[PDB]
Amino acid sequence: KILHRLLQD
Amino acid sequence: HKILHRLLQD
Amino acid sequence: SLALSLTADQMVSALLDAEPPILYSEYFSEASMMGLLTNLADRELVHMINWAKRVPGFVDLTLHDQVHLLECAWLEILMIGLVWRSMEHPGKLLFAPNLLLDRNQVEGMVEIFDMLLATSSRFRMMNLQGEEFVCLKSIILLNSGVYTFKDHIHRVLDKITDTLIHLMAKAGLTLQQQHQRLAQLLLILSHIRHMSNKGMEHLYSMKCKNVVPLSDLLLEMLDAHR
Amino acid sequence: SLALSLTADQMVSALLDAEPPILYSEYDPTRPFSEASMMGLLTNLADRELVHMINWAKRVPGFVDLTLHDQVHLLECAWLEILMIGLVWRSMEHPGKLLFAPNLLLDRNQVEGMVEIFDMLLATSSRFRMMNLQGEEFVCLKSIILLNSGVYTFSTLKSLEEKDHIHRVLDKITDTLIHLMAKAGLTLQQQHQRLAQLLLILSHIRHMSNKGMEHLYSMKCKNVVPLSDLLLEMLDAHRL
Numbered sequence: 001k002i003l004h005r006l007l008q009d
Numbered sequence: 010h011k012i013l014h015r016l017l018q019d
Numbered sequence: 020s021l022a023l024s025l026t027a028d029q030m031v032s033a034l035l036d037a038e039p040p041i042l043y044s045e046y047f048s049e050a051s052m053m054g055l056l057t058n059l060a061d062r063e064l065v066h067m068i069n070w071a072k073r074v075p076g077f078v079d080l081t082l083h084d085q086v087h088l089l090e091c092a093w094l095e096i097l098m099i100g101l102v103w104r105s106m107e108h109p110g111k112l113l114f115a116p117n118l119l120l121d122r123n124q125v126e127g128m129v130e131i132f133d134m135l136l137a138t139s140s141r142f143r144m145m146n147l148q149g150e151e152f153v154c155l156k157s158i159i160l161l162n163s164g165v166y167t168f169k170d171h172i173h174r175v176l177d178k179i180t181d182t183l184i185h186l187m188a189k190a191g192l193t194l195q196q197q198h199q200r201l202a203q204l205l206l207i208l209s210h211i212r213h214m215s216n217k218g219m220e221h222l223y224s225m226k227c228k229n230v231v232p233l234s235d236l237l238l239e240m241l242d243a244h245r
Numbered sequence: 246s247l248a249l250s251l252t253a254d255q256m257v258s259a260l261l262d263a264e265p266p267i268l269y270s271e272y273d274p275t276r277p278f279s280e281a282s283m284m285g286l287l288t289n290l291a292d293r294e295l296v297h298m299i300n301w302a303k304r305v306p307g308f309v310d311l312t313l314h315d316q317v318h319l320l321e322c323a324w325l326e327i328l329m330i331g332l333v334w335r336s337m338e339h340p341g342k343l344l345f346a347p348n349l350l351l352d353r354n355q356v357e358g359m360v361e362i363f364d365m366l367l368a369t370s371s372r373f374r375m376m377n378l379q380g381e382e383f384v385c386l387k388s389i390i391l392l393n394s395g396v397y398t399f400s401t402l403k404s405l406e407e408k409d410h411i412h413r414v415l416d417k418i419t420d421t422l423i424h425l426m427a428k429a430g431l432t433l434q435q436q437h438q439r440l441a442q443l444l445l446i447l448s449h450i451r452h453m454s455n456k457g458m459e460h461l462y463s464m465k466c467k468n469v470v471p472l473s474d475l476l477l478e479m480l481d482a483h484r485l
């Protein structure tokens with residue numbers, strides 16, 4: 001879920 | 010030489 | 020080339036008249052399921068090749084170009100045909116009139132099955148017409164392998180684009196609705212391409228499994244993608 | 246949603262503004278390159294571009310209106326497509342060559358059966374050059390790939406509205422494309438044809454992406470070329 005992390009930072 | 014060749018020519 | 024001199028209505032009539040018939044299944048485990056679907060696919064392939072010849076502009080190409088196009092698009096054409104006749108059967112795929120199947124029923128497949136169902140649902144949502152379907156199918160034939168070889172094919176594709184717009188204008192759609200619907204239709208081909216590639220990879224594993232009887236024709240068309 | 250309220254010109258400016266930067270490779274023309282070291286440069290380059298892509302996606306009109314889950318899905322589906330069309334675009338003015346980076350301009354001879362994909366990428370670039378693709382058209386296509394590639398794989402009445410919202414944005418982008426071609430002096434017939442020609446190329450881009458994804462899986466199993474955690478994470482998302 002790295003993509004999920006980068007999608008809200 | 011392939012089957013597709015024959016079917017396309019007939 | 021006769022294809023470019025054809026009018027829009029004459030283009031539709033040519034495509035409609037060239038439509039391949041609906042075949043029946045030879046009438047469930049995972050060995051019999053695959054055996055039936057591949058048997059059906061091999062027989063439909065034979066009709067597709069004869070349908071390809073009747074597609075305006077396809078005869079004007081060299082034999083080798085015809086081979087390249089058919090090798091590249093055969094599974095897409097099978098799939099869009101399967102999706103088309105499954106429109107009036109939500110949640111089900113009509114492989115044959117005596118073979119209407121569940122997503123319940125052997126994988127590999129469930130991913131592709133749901134994608135095929137999703138496409139069928141999209142067509143139904145768009146109320147895809149028969150005249151529009153035959154245009155899309157021909158487009159797949161000429162477009163799928165054109166970037167792996169040019170002017171002739173692209174001009175025939177332009178002709179079908181005109182034919183699609185012609186159909187939408189006849190249906191009474193506005194100018195905005197025409198290019199919007201044209202977009203919605205052609206974007207679906209991207210998904211159909213995706214499904215074919217997933218279906219081709221699965222077909223390779225079936226060959227390597229050496230359980231399901233595959234015809235030499237179906238094997239030769241499979242080798243072309245490898 | 247403000248995406249449905251943007252004019253064609255406002256849609257274009259929003260997309261041009263959001264454009265990711267062109268990154269440089271750590272390629273060194275002195276240092277020799279094995280087929281795995283060269284591949285390592287590209288995968289490293291793809292990794293850094295992905296991060297910029299993600300922040301680019303956020304600025305794409307309509308994308309931030311979607312749920313976080315839907316955003317992840319669309320990006321997991323179209324990430325290699327978006328990379329490839331970007332590569333193809335900046336390679337337009339370099340015939341027979343692919344400009345992976347300003348300091349990394351390769352031809353088909355420079356390796357390992359990735360060559361088929363390399364040729365398709367060249368043919369796509371050649372197609373754009375022949376069609377004289379414009380930057381305003383390019384950014385539209387790229388946004389279309391983002392929203393369209395994963396929309397056919399997303400159950401409820403509520404989810405229904407999200408997919409309908411996506412198509413509504415797609416229509417606006419279609420409108421934007423038509424507006425551009427109309428301003429270019431093209432007749433209605435020429436507009437519809439060019440629109441068709443552009444969208445058909447996306448079918449080919451999907452094809453190259455599926456092929457490339459297959460190789461990326463093989464490289465992982467080979468365990469020679471280094472791959473980032475994010476890249477492996479995007480890769481496994483497709484192999485499922």
Ligand SMILES: Clc1ccc(C(c2ccc(Cl)cc2)C(Cl)(Cl)Cl)cc1
Binds near residue numbers: 288
């Ligand atoms: Cl010929 C070729 C080279 C690189 C690619 C990719 C690619 C595409 C764009 C960019 Cl910027 C980097 C790498 C991989 Cl290595 Cl991620 Cl599969 C695809 C095909």
Ligand SMILES: ClC(Cl)=C(c1ccc(Cl)cc1)c1ccc(Cl)cc1
Binds near residue numbers: 128218
């Ligand atoms: Cl592999 C193959 Cl030939 C398939 C196929 C078989 C017959 C026809 Cl007409 C059309 C397609 C197929 C069918 C269903 C699913 Cl879920 C996946 C593949």
